[PDB]
RNA sequence: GACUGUGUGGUGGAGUUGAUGCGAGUGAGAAUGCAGGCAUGAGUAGCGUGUGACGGGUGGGAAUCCCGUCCGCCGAUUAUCCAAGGGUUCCAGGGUCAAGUUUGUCUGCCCUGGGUGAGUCGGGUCCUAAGGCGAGGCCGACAGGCGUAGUCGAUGGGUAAC
RNA sequence: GUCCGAACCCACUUCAGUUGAAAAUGGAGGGGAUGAGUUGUGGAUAGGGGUGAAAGGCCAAUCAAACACCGUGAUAGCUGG
RNA sequence: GUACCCCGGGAGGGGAGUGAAAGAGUUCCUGAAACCGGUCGCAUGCAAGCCGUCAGAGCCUGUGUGGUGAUGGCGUGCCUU
């Protein structure tokens, strides 16, 4: 099949506006010495650590 | 252990078997490995089965582990270092932690690592 | 598949070469016409 | 004497695009599509400037009908009564009286009632 | 008739208000794909925006993040503002030069390919201007 | 009415207004019209048979570059060497606009410099085949056709290294 | 001008492709496979002509008369503008 | 033909300089339309719309005219043939 007619501006924009992305949320690193933003349930790219203020196990050597 | 339900890694179940076995071998070789989320979570059960089998050291057990792995050096590592490291552990010999994503293809990445500290 | 052009330098020179064109009066007039037009390649 | 068309050509295009400066879609952006709607717009405006007389007369007649029926008199009898009484106040002023000066309209209704043939 | 108060990007975007801006011209990516991230980043605090764009998975995040950082630096240098009290007042993506290329297809046909490009503009002002 | 102001700005930077004549490549919405630019479909289909994994390195940036280790694939060919054809793609160093159906620090790409050595190898300097040309010549209004003596022409003969 | 069967040559069936990987192919089978075989290099035949184990087939990816240029801005009681 | 400085790997931009002019910065005179966007005003999620037209509230603006337009009526494109 082929598009019979050129789609109107209103309809094209109605469909196109739904092509979007949500913002990444980010969470503050539990390490007091780092305090950076990292993905939830993900090792902090700055400190390379994971876990609550206590645990704090190293995950990434960075 | 349990099969993978959905489509297999590497475009073929035989290749998935090869991938999981090699990935477990590399995990045992290096202690830790960054291997994306799905591969790590799929290799965890097999790796823990192998570690549990290696927790008790007999010639028959070493041959059974060598059925998998197939690198006797890695078998020696598993039966000498990893095995005795888990004398008191009742399972859970490995852990997986997410790292981020790959820039090239947005693969969610994670590191799977054998437990290092002694339970006692 | 096998396409129309199958190169052969010897065949090309024998067919569309300068001496081939000079052999016949039609080819000489072709060279003259290409000289009038201004082609940098008078022949193959 | 070669002549380039652009300077003279753009004038009608600017005129039409200005005339079509509230239209939806291509009708306000493209000269050819705006031109087609301006033909329809002109035809509709000419037709409606002549239908406006009838529309407003109908509105006046409806309002007069309502106001006179409030006094127990139909529009036809009211108009016949005014015609017989000889009061040539038209549908328009009568409707304005009905909306605004209802007492004057009611006095006219009484005039029409008295001027009825009573037959 | 040409004269004084000649137009400028700063005059058009800020107009005697404090703040600065930055333009990345001829970004070798599509304008729509840049807008997909511009819409998210518009209106945010600048530091939050750049930290988020370090984690945004789209490829448009990197050029937009660099533009925001450049605008922040321009503000810090030319108006004494601090990076932590700036917010992205404006942000938009216009279209730049497009290159026509050819992709061969079946049966000897050639299909047009458009390599698009974008201009990214970010305007940062002090957060006190948000309620003004 | 086609249109327009000797109203008032903006942009712009070198011409041009009114009167009256004169001359027209003098007016576009259609020709499945021509050229360019740009939408629509649409962030959609596709990304050209396949098996990669990991450790380390480089880097502003790495699934896609380098190194290593596992693993897999071809093996009458996914190996090696020629001819034809191509023509500098070869090597070293620098580069990441473009090109590469993604990324790219990488390249058969770009830039700069460099690289091919024969008495014996493959051709010529030797030989002829098919066929071509052809002194004179014969034939043909002209243009030309054919052909003798000859002279070319490898895909063959001849020819001294491992 | 034997038989079975790779290379090689072919193109019978089927499926896929049919904006294809490909302007005729790919997968699976299939015919010939010492012969009227197949293939490399060079050569010969040219458009009312060539060649044709003959289908009006083929003669540089559309041949009941190739292609290019010229007569030429052919002509069209027709269609469009 | 943009010294120098800043963000940036660069590209690009921000200051500053040159110039009468740099929104004349080499893709460089003038810079139209399609097309793509940011901002602001109004309308719009009970509605059947050749998209206009006539009537018309409300809001915005008042640069006291303009913008928008709830709602009612009427209303089947352009060209060719
Ligand atoms: Mg719809
Ligand atoms: Mg199952
Ligand atoms: Mg897949
Ligand atoms: Mg198998
Ligand atoms: Mg050919
Ligand atoms: Mg009634
Ligand atoms: Mg002026
Ligand atoms: Mg082709
Ligand atoms: Mg005059
Ligand atoms: Mg004309
Ligand atoms: Mg036109
Ligand atoms: Mg066109
Ligand atoms: Mg589009
Ligand atoms: Mg999608
Ligand atoms: Mg679709
Ligand atoms: Mg789809
Ligand atoms: Mg798809
Ligand atoms: Mg593939
Ligand atoms: Mg690959
Ligand atoms: Mg390797
Ligand atoms: Mg094999
Ligand atoms: Mg063998
Ligand atoms: Mg050579
Ligand atoms: Mg070179
Ligand atoms: Mg080259
Ligand atoms: Mg090379
Ligand atoms: Mg690329
Ligand atoms: Mg390189
Ligand atoms: Mg190199
Ligand atoms: Mg001799
Ligand atoms: Mg001879
Ligand atoms: Mg002679
Ligand atoms: Mg001789
Ligand atoms: Mg010779
Ligand atoms: Mg036989
Ligand atoms: Mg062959
Ligand atoms: Mg058939
Ligand atoms: Mg079919
Ligand atoms: Mg037989
Ligand atoms: Mg020949
Ligand atoms: Mg027949
Ligand atoms: Mg043919
Ligand atoms: Mg004929
Ligand atoms: Mg004639
Ligand atoms: Mg004619
Ligand atoms: Mg017709
Ligand atoms: Mg001056
Ligand atoms: Mg200007
Ligand atoms: Mg330009
Ligand atoms: Mg300009
Ligand atoms: Mg409602
Ligand atoms: Mg109805
Ligand atoms: Zn941290």
- Domains in chain E: boundaries: 1-132
Give which of E107, E4, E1, E124 is closest to E68, Cα–Cα: E124
* Per-residue flag: C10 CB under 7 A of strand G: yes
Report the DSSP pairing between strands A37-38 and A49-50.
unpaired
Domain around D4: 1-119
Q: CB contact, 8 Å: B98 with chain A?
A: yes
Contact E77, E118 (CB under 8 A): no
Q: CB contact, 8 Å: E15 with chain B?
A: no
A29 among annotated binding-site residues: yes
Query: Would the CB atoms of A60 and B98 count as touching at under 8 Å?
Result: no
**Domain count across chain B:** 1
Q: In angstroms, what CA-CA distances link D74 with B87, D77, D81? A: 109, 5, 11
Query: What is the experimental method?
Result: cryo-EM
- Separation CA E54–CA E88 (nearest Å): 16
**Burial level of E75, CB count in 10 A (0-12/13-18/19+)?**
buried
Neighbours of B35 (CB within 10 A): 20
Chains in contact with E via at least 3 Cβ–Cβ pairs below 8 Å = A, B
Any idea where the domains of chain C sit in the sequence?
1-44
Structure tokens at D99: 């909306």
Structure tokens at A9: 């501006």
Within 8 A by CB and 6+ apart from D28, the residues are: D17, D20, D21, D22, D34
The distance of A51 to chain E (nearest Cα, Å) reads: 20
Q: In angstroms, what CA-CA distances link D78 with A55, B33, B35, B62, D119? A: 97, 101, 96, 117, 15
Within 8 A by CB and 6+ apart from B102, the residues are: B36, B109
Beta bridge partners of B101: B108
Resolution in A: 2.7
Identify from E35, E55, E57, E88 which residue to disrupt to test chain A contact, counting A C-beta atoms within 10 A and taking the largest count: E55
Within 8 A by CB and 6+ apart from D60, the residues are: D91, D92, D94, D95
- For chain B, how are helix, strand and coil distributed in percent, rounded to 5? 50, 15, 35
Question: Is the four-CA dihedral D91, D92, D98, D99 of positive or negative sign?
Answer: positive
Give which of E67, E51, E49, E45 is closest to E126, Cα–Cα: E45
For chain D, positions 7-46, list CB contacts with chain A under 8 A: 25
Structure tokens at A10: 């209103």
Contact D92, D53 (CB under 8 A): no
The 8-class DSSP code of residue D31 comes to: H
Within 8 A by CB and 6+ apart from A5, the residues are: none
Give counts: helices (H), strands (E), chain E.
4, 5
Domain around B15: 1-120
């Amino acid at each position: 099949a082929v598009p019979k007619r050129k789609m109107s501006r209103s309809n094209t924009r109605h469909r196109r506006s739904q092509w979007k992305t949500v913002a990444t949320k980010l969470v503050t690193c539990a390490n007091p010495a780092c305090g950076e933003k990292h993905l939830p349930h993900t090792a902090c790219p700055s400190c390379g650590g994971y876990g609550p203020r206590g645990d704090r196990r190293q995950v990434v050597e960075a | 252990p349990k099969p993978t339900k959905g489509p297999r890694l590497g475009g073929s179940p035989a290749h998935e078997r090869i991938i999981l076995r090699n990935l477990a071998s590399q995990l045992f070789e290096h202690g830790r490995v960054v291997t994306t989320v799905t591969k790590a979570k799929r290799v965890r059960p097999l790796a823990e089965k192998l570690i549990n089998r290696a927790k008790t050291d007999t010639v028959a057990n070493r041959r059974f582990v060598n059925r998998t792995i197939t690198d006797r050096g890695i078998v020696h590592i598993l039966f000498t270092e990893i095995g005795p490291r888990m004398e008191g552990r009742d399972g859970g010999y490995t852990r997986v932690t997410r790292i981020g994503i790959r820039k090239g293809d947005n693969a969610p990445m994670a590191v799977i690592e054998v437990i290092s500290d002694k339970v006692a | 598949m096998k396409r129309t052009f199958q190169p052969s330098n010897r065949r090309r020179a024998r067919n569309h070469g300068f001496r081939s064109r000079m052999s016949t009066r039609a080819g000489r007039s072709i060279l003259a016409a290409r000289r009038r037009k201004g082609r940098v390649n008078l022949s193959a | 004497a070669r002549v380039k068309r652009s300077v003279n050509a753009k004038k009608k295009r600017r005129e039409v695009l200005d005339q079509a400066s509230g239209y939806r879609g291509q009708r306000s952006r493209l000269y050819r599509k705006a031109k087609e709607q301006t033909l329809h717009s002109a035809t509709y405006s000419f037709r409606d400037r002549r239908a406006k007389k009838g529309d407003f007369r109908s509105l006046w007649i409806q309002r007069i009908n309502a106001a006179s029926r409030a006094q127990g008199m139909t529009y036809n009898r009211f108009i016949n009564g005014l015609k017989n009484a000889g009061v040539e106040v038209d549908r328009k002023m009568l409707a304005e009286l009905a909306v605004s000066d209802i007492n004057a309209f009611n006095s006219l209704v009484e005039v029409a009632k008295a001027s009825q043939p009573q037959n | 008739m040409s004269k004084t108060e000649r137009p400028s990007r700063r005059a058009a975007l800020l107009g005697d208000r404090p703040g600065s801006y930055a333009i990345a011209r001829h970004v070798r990516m599509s304008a729509s794909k840049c807008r997909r991230v511009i819409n998210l980043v518009r209106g945010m605090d600048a530091v939050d925006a750049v930290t988020m764009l370090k984690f945004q998975p789209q490829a448009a995040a990197e050029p937009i993040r660099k533009v925001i950082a450049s605008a922040m630096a321009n503000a810090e240098q030319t108006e004494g503002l601090r990076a932590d009290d700036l917010y992205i007042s404006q942000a938009f993506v216009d279209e730049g030069i497009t290159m026509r290329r050819i992709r061969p297809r079946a049966k000897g046909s050639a299909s047009r390919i458009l390599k698009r490009s974008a201009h990214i503009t970010v305007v940062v002002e002090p957060k006190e201007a948000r309620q003004a």
